[PDB]
Design a protein around this ligand. Sequence first.
Ligand code: NAG
Length: 499
Amino acid sequence: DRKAPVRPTPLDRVIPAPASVDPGGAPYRITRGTHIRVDDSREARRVGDYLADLLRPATGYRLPVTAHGHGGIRLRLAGGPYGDEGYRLDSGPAGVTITARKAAGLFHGVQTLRQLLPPAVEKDSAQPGPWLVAGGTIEDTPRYAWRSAMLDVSRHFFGVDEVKRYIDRVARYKYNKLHLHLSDDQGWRIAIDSWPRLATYGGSTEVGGGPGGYYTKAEYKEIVRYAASRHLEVVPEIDMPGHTNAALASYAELNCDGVAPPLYTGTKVGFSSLCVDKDVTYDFVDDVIGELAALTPGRYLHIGGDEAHSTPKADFVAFMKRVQPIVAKYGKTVVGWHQLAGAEPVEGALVQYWGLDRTGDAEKAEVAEAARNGTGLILSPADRTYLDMKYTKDTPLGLSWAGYVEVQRSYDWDPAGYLPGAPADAVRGVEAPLWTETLSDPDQLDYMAFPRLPGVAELGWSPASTHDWDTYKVRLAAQAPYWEAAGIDFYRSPQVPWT
Ligand SMILES: CC(=O)N[C@@H]1[C@@H](O)[C@H](O)[C@@H](CO)O[C@H]1O
């Protein structure tokens, strides 16, 4: 009965592991007459409508959302110790109530609710259920505030609808930030009015050749809006001064020798550089950052900084000294890859650590030192949470430069004690990046993102006391019939005892 169990899933069998699970009593059962009762506010109705949309196809129930009466599913905003993102979920014969201080907390409780319901909830046509929700109480708040997924749309372009699909994948696991890698050597993916060839020329291809693509400002705004409705803050990245061939190919004047390189369709890294010694470089960066900041309601702007291997170290330092303030000039907080730690992060900056177990002590120390100097740390180790990395030598997609990363390796660590010498309170959270050198359609993104994506979300969300591979893998195994019913391809790791 994998597909429609006789009994409800246990209250604690959700990912991320909730901070507190107190099972008891009889379950709630959704039936054809169940109403979704919300507060009389637009933002409460928005979460109710989102929930109703998730449940209508598989139940075939009306599930009206209203602000009157005693509905069997109640979403309510109230004072409580749940913070900006936490919630309480109460379940029993009298109904399900999700209580939070903010809409994002109600939204997170909905993500829990959809895992308490059975896998048939994922289907697009009406199903018998039964639509049971285990009885008891869950109280849940996040460990870290930076819980991020990245999608590379530079190596292969993914359009608005494909990004919305990826957004809905990550929303399941309470990620709250979406990092978009909007430019690299093989593509420039955001239209800039002051430099119109970036998109029309630099966006014209991708890895492997053929058509590429880019977002108009209207499309980018729609991605941001859709992400916001799934409580994801969009963090855009324009990588500089390396990984810049698409821009360089578009404007001859940006290049050291004044010659535009060809458009690049390979998969090498490290070979491109903005010209640090030319004034037009900083006009360009200021134009791009200013236009991107105007489209970005979130707090953060990512300037990259990785693999500027055609930029001599002293020039990289000078470049970063000059461009970091452009970000604050347009009202945003700088984020960069942890190479920025070698180039004097400005106050308030965060750096994203993509090192590995084998990274040298000196490099780790430079990052721990920036943490001591007040730089926030985002942890996305390339041998842990890079979702493009192969599971084993036989994986048919992805890369292997960081070694192989099976499911247990991806999950089985503690952000608080990961980087030697780094103060635990400098760790802002975690990110799971999905690079797309090898991935050109949404099914391939699913196969590499799943099943490690929920594990990185748990590292960002769950208390360290709940962390345990042997019991986590049981909760992970339980996702198989959900993913199967939803059409989500995933790697059936032999480490996981799949349901
Ligand atoms: C910060 C970073 O990750 N840089 C590159 C990235 O451009 C590339 O897509 C990835 C593939 O795993 O390998 C890294 O070396």
